Amino acid sequence: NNFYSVEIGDSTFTVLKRYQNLKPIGSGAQGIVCAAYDAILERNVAIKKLSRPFQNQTHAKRAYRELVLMKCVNHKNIIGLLNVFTPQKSLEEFQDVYIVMELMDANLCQVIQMELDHERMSYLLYQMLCGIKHLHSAGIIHRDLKPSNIVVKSDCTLKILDFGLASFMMTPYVVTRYYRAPEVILGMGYKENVDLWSVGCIMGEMVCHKILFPGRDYIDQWNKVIEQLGTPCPEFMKKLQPTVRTYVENRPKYAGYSFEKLFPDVLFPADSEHNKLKASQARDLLSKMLVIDASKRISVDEALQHPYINVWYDPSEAEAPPPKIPDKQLDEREHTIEEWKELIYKEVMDLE
Numbered sequence: 001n002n003f004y005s006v007e008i009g010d011s012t013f014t015v016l017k018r019y020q021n022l023k024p025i026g027s028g029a030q031g032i033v034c035a036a037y038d039a040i041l042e043r044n045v046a047i048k049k050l051s052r053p054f055q056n057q058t059h060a061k062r063a064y065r066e067l068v069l070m071k072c073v074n075h076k077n078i079i080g081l082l083n084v085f086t087p088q089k090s091l092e093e094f095q096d097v098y099i100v101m102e103l104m105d106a107n108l109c110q111v112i113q114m115e116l117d118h119e120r121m122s123y124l125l126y127q128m129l130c131g132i133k134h135l136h137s138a139g140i141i142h143r144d145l146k147p148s149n150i151v152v153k154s155d156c157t158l159k160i161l162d163f164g165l166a167s168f169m170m171t172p173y174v175v176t177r178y179y180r181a182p183e184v185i186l187g188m189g190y191k192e193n194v195d196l197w198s199v200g201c202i203m204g205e206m207v208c209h210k211i212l213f214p215g216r217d218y219i220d221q222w223n224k225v226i227e228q229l230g231t232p233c234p235e236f237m238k239k240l241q242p243t244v245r246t247y248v249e250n251r252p253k254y255a256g257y258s259f260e261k262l263f264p265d266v267l268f269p270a271d272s273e274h275n276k277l278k279a280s281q282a283r284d285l286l287s288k289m290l291v292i293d294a295s296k297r298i299s300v301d302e303a304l305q306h307p308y309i310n311v312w313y314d315p316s317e318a319e320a321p322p323p324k325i326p327d328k329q330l331d332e333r334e335h336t337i338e339e340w341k342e343l344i345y346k347e348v349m350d351l352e
């Protein structure tokens, strides 16, 4: 037989014999991930087990979307597919999906605990911006970027792990909402620069080493935002639904703090003239990302062209050919369990 089984915690991993020495590196509501050695490729890989992905609509849609996008996206700043398999030998018996991926060294939560020089900080931000733009070019807006779903290597290279939001679910896993934009928090429309809000929260956290807006729920989340940045102007208020508008206008009013006070020189390398100029430019970029009103917030391309970032600019990275997404209905599906099962199985086996 071409497979063997190993127990990983309370889970059983049944994998191809080419993959050896499995070790757990991560977990989530969607599945469980092990590092492993690929004896054929002669390199380390990551293996994600998806257990019965067709069990409900939220898991099924996410799994199907993940499979399709990994098969059609190929960019250095998005985690790359190496293999997919199932150990079950028929549609009738089909249960689990295994996705094999590039293995990276660490997540951004680990990097946030470190003091970063301007070269490394700006290069990480550049790469995030290239990954995001590439997704936007294919009509994919992430909306859920956070430190835990961004990974790095010791050479400062960076990859985004996931493709973002689509959703009730029975799960012990708690949802992190600290990086979500005001327009997502308040149920407004959104465009591409929704993702720039999240990059600003991440950047701010890299500088300060603390979560900017650590809200317990969406109501607390909003409070934390206005405390730091100030109550938005009347022009923004007028874009909200009446029921939301009454709520937002009724909160206590806050003046907010200047970006000089939010992010002072002591948080940046600021010894040499070189570092002093860079600190000033870093603060300017923050001031253009952490903007409540999306109509006044910076675009992804404006961010790529910013003085802090543009030293890295390369069109083969920042202007790559868009992904060819085959499924025109990739974000608007409703199916039965047996239908999702067959759709996913066909994708894993590569059938139509």
Ligand SMILES: CC(C)c1cc2c(-c3ccc(S(=O)(=O)NC4CCS(=O)(=O)CC4)cc3)ccnc2[nH]1
Residues within 6 Å of the ligand: 025, 026, 027, 028, 029, 030, 031, 032, 033, 046, 048, 101, 102, 103, 104, 105, 106, 107, 148, 149, 151, 161
């Ligand atoms: C942490 C670091 C060592 C690392 C994680 C990782 C993954 C990885 C990919 C997906 C998952 S997951 O399917 O469990 N998704 C999680 C990510 C963390 S989260 O808080 O966003 C919940 C979903 C876990 C690890 C893939 C490749 N290299 C890696 N290096």
